[PDB]
Design a protein around this ligand. Structure first.
Ligand code: CA
Lengths: 182, 181
């Protein structure tokens, strides 16, 4: 069984796949950047670290008692600018293990009032969200060491970001031989 | 794992790179130190597009091989792709993520050794005392491509293994004084 954790309110990084998965088996995903000022930010980190140290401890405690170990990177990282980014992901499909078929799972997304949306807005970078998730410790492999996966369970869309209009939007509209910053 | 070596286009380093010294966050997990730099390159530089082509080709090739291997005897983990080690920033630039471990266990001798990352100036002169490379610095990097299969943690992708760095131009607040007192 899985215990549900809820993140602090954060800002979605670009390239989120919430309204639709990133497609091979699909994957929903969002990198959520939270201000370190939010105490919930440190608690999210503490929970993940605890999970890892306990699980890795156990993993080594059986590798050694029936072999055939190293640690990997945490699913979060302080950006050094007063914010920490957390990486959430979950598959878009699974195998009906009763009746064999592959089934598509849509990620539940709720608005700020808690209302589930059928037609989910595409979530652009800068959007404010809260996410519910599970901690899924995993063992070391040839690619990366043992760590924890923040398995996405659902998302609450708090603020939908505008597409365009900012600094980036202008990259596409440069003026030859014009004014240049100082 | 420095076999076929590629050279990046001239780019700009994102802040908090670890080139002059590695990142020993130890961040519990890989104790191993890590050298890393995120290099942002203008999309109109032709080498940028070629860099992407090469990574994508390496990925497609290795993923195709892994998939055929898996489908030849499906041994619950299905094939899937991870994120590429580069991303278009939507502003005419693309950021590439380079990294490598700061230590390794020797194959012949089994000795764990530390790796010093070679940094060269714009004319190829090895810099003996490497300056801390701040955000905004102009660099080129040498790297190898290390593809990897999908696993429980992440989907199949490619690591841009940092090999060495050329410092073309070194760039010139509140972190230290956080919260109270
Ligand atoms: Ca535009």
């Amino acid at each position: 069984a899985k215990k549900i954790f809820t993140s602090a309110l954060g800002t979605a990084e670009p390239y989120a796949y919430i309204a639709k998965p990133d497609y091979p088996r699909g994957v929903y995903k969002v990198d959520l950047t939270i201000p370190n000022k939010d105490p919930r930010c440190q608690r999210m980190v503490d929970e993940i670290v605890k999970c890892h140290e306990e699980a890795y401890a156990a993993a080594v405690e059986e590798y050694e008692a029936n072999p055939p170990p190293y640690e990997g990177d945490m699913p979060f990282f302080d950006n050094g600018d007063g914010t920490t980014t957390f990486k959430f992901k979950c598959y878009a499909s699974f195998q009906d293990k009763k009746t064999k078929e592959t089934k598509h799972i849509n990620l539940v997304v709720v608005d700020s009032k808690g209302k589930k949306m059928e037609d989910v807005p595409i979530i652009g970078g800068g959007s404010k969200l809260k996410v519910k998730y599970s901690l899924v410790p995993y063992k070391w492999n040839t690619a990366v060491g043992a760590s924890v996966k923040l398995q996405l369970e659902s998302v609450m869309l708090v603020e939908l970001a505008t597409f365009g209009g900012g600094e980036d939007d202008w990259a596409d509209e440069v003026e030859e031989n014009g004014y240049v910053a100082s």
